[PDB]
Symmetry: D2
Subunit: 260 residues, 4 copies
């Protein structure tokens, strides 16, 4: 632990499956600042994957949560209510889309993929926000993750661009609903980060390298970058910001053509 | 008929339910400019309701279509293929959401309503565009309708805001896909057209730069831009046709609160 | 003459320097649709250059105007008042910036260039709109030109990006002011039109959804929308006429880097 | 002092004339986190106003700076170079416009007001950024202030809306220029804050109350809100964000009509 920005703040982080993800980068930053964190895992099968990550962060409460199953989500919040009685933050780092449809054209998106992607990548945040609300009695902060594909067309993203635009819109509506209770709702629009030594996807190598060479900072977004932004939005530093999508992308969102 | 801007252009307008519809305003405008139009109607049960609208427009082709049903959409495009052989334009002016959840809070949105609203209000446009594409062999123009609730919170617009934001994003992705065939894809973000609706209309009247509400004719005008050769150069765009409402950052100091 | 969309509309087009100008494309389009146009020229010294352009358009009124000089602008509007008695439209298609500072870094921009660029490229539109207003007694439409460099960094656009962002903002404030008189105020954000310029053109060709460059005709089309009755319902807007470039978030994977 | 987020970071804050301003709120937050700050003052006349503010923050270096005078700006940076040798941050909290023109219509803006407003409210940031650049040898962060009037028409703002749109655009261009050296450039778009017990301006009372009752958080932006956002962007937490305008406005920017 390196500071106290999150000292006394309890929160659940949804989406930590390995030590390479944005969700991990957020968990590490808030734990390093004194937060008390619960991590979710998809099902009994994956508990073994999450335990060591949890142990290494000092997390003592791990809970099953499959965000596509309302009962799973309800149970998870019941556990947090029982263990803690209240909640200060929620981090939603969950997305899903059919990988085979990403390789093709958006216009050929299937209804099943569209609805499943929308459910998991967008609606789940709304449902989670509704369940968090009654536990967040001393205000709080609810955070999700987005990406520039919500705003502009980028490769290998297709229906997720549409889901993330929906998400970013939902953040605004939720902020209004939850703001009277001083609950902030925000998104981080993260630049691409390498999670895999080889994804085997040329578009992903392309996305990463294009961002690296053409972003104002001339590097890729790191987990620590995203951690720092999450610390802003989830601690008291971020009290006056809600409904916002903050770009944590080394500046890429300002580029209209190419670095020269 | 008032002009020839759409002369020789064939297209299908989806969403003409009555003579108050945005779809109706667009139909009237493109028909007045020489377009050959097909109007969809939901099913035979409701055909009697579209008939007199078709007749007053001079439309001679009406075709059943439930935009929530892939087979229905496929058959509608097969009809157009058989009757016309090619297609110049599509107007998608259809939205659905649970009326009661609109009256509540967005945070209380149910899954069923979210998905149903998203299917009809957003996905149907993408599917329809997928079926239109093979018919649009001399380029063309595909147009949908949105609202400022996609960009900013409008009370009691709730999940439709989220659906329209998805729709406007889909316009961009579709523009990239269909642009290879010279097909443009655009949206009109319309102001409310002259309880909850009344309040919104009144609010837009008092606070829009032009100090009036959007009309069907305003929307028909913008549709004529985007659907005719005038608009060949614009794709992926959402054009505000809202008397300027979109630029206002606060209630006008000169307007009463209501 | 190809149509009557602008029949009976009188307006002044500022910025017609040659037959490659955006101003020229708009002039040709509104003249082809029946508009009565006045063209400005900078001073008598350069009148010989506008003459044949005016003549080929059928324009019979040309008037000196240096947009950096308040008295020049005033006298131009006094001429139009005397000749016409009222005005329906204004097109402002004029920009200036130091060509050498464009080749450098934005951070090295000098004060003199910043202010001069801002005066000519941004303030002149506001002043011109102030002088047009009293003449626009049956509503009307005031139109300026912008570029995507207002919204995103385009290399070597530097201070013009900052000026165009100011211009697009001014469009919104002006829409609120002039909307009371039913005058619309809008911008077209144009793609580059078919060294540095070539690179930009090529880049837009490879990466725009429609896989082609913007043309003068595309821009004339959009101007016809906004300046005619078709566009009565839109104000404060910046419409992208750029073959969809504005929706692209990254170089196309199918395009070569250049 | 309450923490260490800015420990070892040296920076100049331009625009602290009293203890009610956004610039003061920023100075207080970064000083409270261990920053070493220089405050500027307009001229010898106002040194007396700034000294006590400086004393109370623990600031030891105050320097004249009139941002409309290039020599004044150059001298100020010379002083910082001599005293410190390098710089970690700059905060630009300076705007000017003719108050009499604010009361009327934007369309009636005068050329003199337009150019003076643009010079002080927009160009000065660019010039300041150019002077900061060679001193910012271990990266850094340059921050300015903006307001929703840049994006949307709001009352009693007129040409400042145009200047702030220009500013926000300049932030993007500057971020590209300075980003190779890992200098971030960003803006905070602050909600209105009451600085005066009575401004005597009805539009200002209106703006404040409209923001208070219609923002998602149902309160006005505070100096501390803006301080917290400045801490994000100016400390290491903000390393991955550049070219951004972050809304610190209690959510007001998401409102399309009115709270209900």
């Amino acid at each position: 632990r390196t500071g106290m920005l999150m000292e006394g703040k309890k929160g659940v982080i949804i989406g930590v499956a390995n030590d390479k993800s944005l969700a991990w980068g957020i968990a590490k930053a808030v734990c390093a600042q004194g937060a008390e964190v619960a991590l979710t895992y998809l099902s009994e099968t994956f508990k073994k994957r999450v335990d060591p990550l949890a142990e290494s962060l000092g997390v003592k409460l791990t809970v099953p949560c499959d965000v596509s199953d309302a009962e799973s989500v309800d149970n998870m919040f019941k556990v947090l209510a029982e263990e803690w009685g209240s909640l200060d933050f929620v981090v939603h780092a969950v997305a899903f889309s059919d990988k085979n449809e990403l390789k093709g054209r958006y216009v050929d998106t299937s209804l099943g993929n569209f609805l499943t992607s929308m459910h998991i990548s967008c609606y789940s945040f709304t449902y989670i926000a509704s369940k968090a609300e009654p536990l967040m009695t001393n205000g709080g902060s609810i955070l999700t993750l987005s990406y520039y594909g919500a705003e502009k067309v980028v490769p290998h993203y297709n229906v997720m661009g549409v889901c993330k635009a929906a998400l970013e819109a939902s953040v605004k509506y939720l902020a209004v609903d939850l703001g009277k209770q001083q609950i902030r709702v925000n998104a981080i629009s993260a630049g691409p980060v390498r999670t895999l030594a080889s994804s085997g996807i040329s578009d992903f190598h392309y996305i990463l390298t294009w961002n690296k060479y053409n972003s104002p900072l001339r590097r890729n977004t790191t987990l620590d970058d995203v951690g720092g932004a999450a610390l802003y939005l989830l601690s008291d530093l971020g009290r006056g910001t809600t409904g916002e999508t903050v770009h944590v992308d080394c500046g890429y969102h300002v580029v209209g053509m190419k670095s020269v």
